[PDB]
Amino acid sequence: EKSVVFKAEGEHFTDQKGNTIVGSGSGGTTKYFRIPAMCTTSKGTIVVFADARHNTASDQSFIDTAAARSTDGGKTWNKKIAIYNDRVNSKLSRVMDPTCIVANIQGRETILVMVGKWNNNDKTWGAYRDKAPDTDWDLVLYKSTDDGVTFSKVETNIHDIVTKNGTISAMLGGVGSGLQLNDGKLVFPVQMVRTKNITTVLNTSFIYSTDGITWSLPSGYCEGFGSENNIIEFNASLVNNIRNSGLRRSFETKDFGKTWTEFPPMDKKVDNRNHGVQGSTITIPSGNKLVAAHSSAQNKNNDYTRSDISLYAHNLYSGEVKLIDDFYPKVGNASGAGYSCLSYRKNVDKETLYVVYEANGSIEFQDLSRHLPVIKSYN
Numbered sequence: 516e517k518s519v520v521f522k523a524e525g526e527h528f529t530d531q532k533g534n535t536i537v538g539s540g541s542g543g544t545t546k547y548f549r550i551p552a553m554c555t556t557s558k559g560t561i562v563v564f565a566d567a568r569h570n571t572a573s574d575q576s577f578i579d580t581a582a583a584r585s586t587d588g589g590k591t592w593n594k595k596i597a598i599y600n601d602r603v604n605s606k607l608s609r610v611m612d613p614t615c616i617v618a619n620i621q622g623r624e625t626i627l628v629m630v631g632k633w634n635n636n637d638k639t640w641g642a643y644r645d646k647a648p649d650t651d652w653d654l655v656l657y658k659s660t661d662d663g664v665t666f667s668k669v670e671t672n673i674h675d676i677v678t679k680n681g682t683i684s685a686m687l688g689g690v691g692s693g694l695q696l697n698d699g700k701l702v703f704p705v706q707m708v709r710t711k712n713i714t715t716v717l718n719t720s721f722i723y724s725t726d727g728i729t730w731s732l733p734s735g736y737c738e739g740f741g742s743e744n745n746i747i748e749f750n751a752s753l754v755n756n757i758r759n760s761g762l763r764r765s766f767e768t769k770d771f772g773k774t775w776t777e778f779p780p781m782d783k784k785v786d787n788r789n790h791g792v793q794g795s796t797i798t799i800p801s802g803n804k805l806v807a808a809h810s811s812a813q814n815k816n817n818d819y820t821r822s823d824i825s826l827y828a829h830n831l832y833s834g835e836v837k838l839i840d841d842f843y844p845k846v847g848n849a850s851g852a853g854y855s856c857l858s859y860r861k862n863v864d865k866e867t868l869y870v871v872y873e874a875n876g877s878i879e880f881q882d883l884s885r886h887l888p889v890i891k892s893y894n
């Protein structure tokens with residue numbers, strides 16, 4: 516049922532010159548993996564990104580962005596580093612927290628992956644609010660136009676638009692996957708730490724682009740909560756689905772990011788209990804209707820173990836919610852647990868629904884396609 520994408524203490528990567536990366540797992544393996552992101556192409560190719568936390572599960576550690584590629588439906592995986600940290604600080608240099616998009620960008624099928632980058636900061640990003648933006652921070656974007664075989668840096672204006680805004684200390688993608696709108700626009704959900712003088716520490720929003728090079732921020736902000744979030748497109752709205760301690764939150768914007776209001780079909784529908792957790796939210800067509808599929812943890816121990824990572828369906832018309840599958844019905848590792856990413860496509864007449872998720876320091880994959888008739892009914 517499950518394949519292992521990245522095995523904790525079981526992978527060996529090489530650096531840009533071809534020398535092994537000696538981590539702290541047994542045998543000099545990478546110690547721990549976190550924060551999976553999955554994007555599936557029109558060829559059926561699955562690409563899974565994750566933090567390769569070579570030494571420890573801590574966010575403040577030495578991390579590269581690994582990529583695993585499967586062309587056999589998730590049975591086997593070719594693994595490499597997609598994004599290397601800057602190798603300034605052997606304890607702290609890091610590229611982390613991926614969000615991916617698969618899109619047709621002016622005709623060219625592209626996988627985008629966006630990650631935050633730090634070097635010398637020894638604390639989490641909320642501790643750095645004095646500058647607009649933090650000098651240790653960056654937000655980097657890589658692309659593949661060869662079906663996930665090679666990734667190259669994209670030169671963007673993302674750092675510039677954050678500086679121009681003047682009230683953002685640091686920004687990340689929302690974690691998991693972004694989207695391409697029906698009209699072609701590329702949209703990354705984002706999370707941001709505001710400068711100190713702003714009363715709200717965290718906000719959610721999005722960045723958008725036509726070409727993947729020049730990006731824009733909307734003028735408005737959504738309340739931050741636990742800030743990790745995903746966006747779906749539903750009629751003339753963009754709708755988010757945000758981490759929060761307890762009940763997850765969901766807002767809609769009808770003016771392309773100027774204002775946000777609660778979205779009743781998803782707001783407060785799933786309980787992740789203490790601390791909250793990242794969750795993945797996507798749409799699945801059913802005739803000319805849509806259903807939202809969502810994954811996050813039931814968290815039966817009400818703590819950082821984030822047990823029982825589960826798939827839900829949200830009826831976007833009636834607001835009903837139901838549990839479809841508790842696909843990881845296990846207590847997680849409190850060093851870092853609970854995260855997931857869904858991926859749906861219809862390629863020709865073949866519909867696929869896949870998930871990746873955190874499993875005791877490893878990243879696992881499941882093919883959840885057998886659940887599609889149940890999800891699609893929920894309209």
Ligand SMILES: [K+]
Binds near residue numbers: 574
């Ligand atoms: K964190």
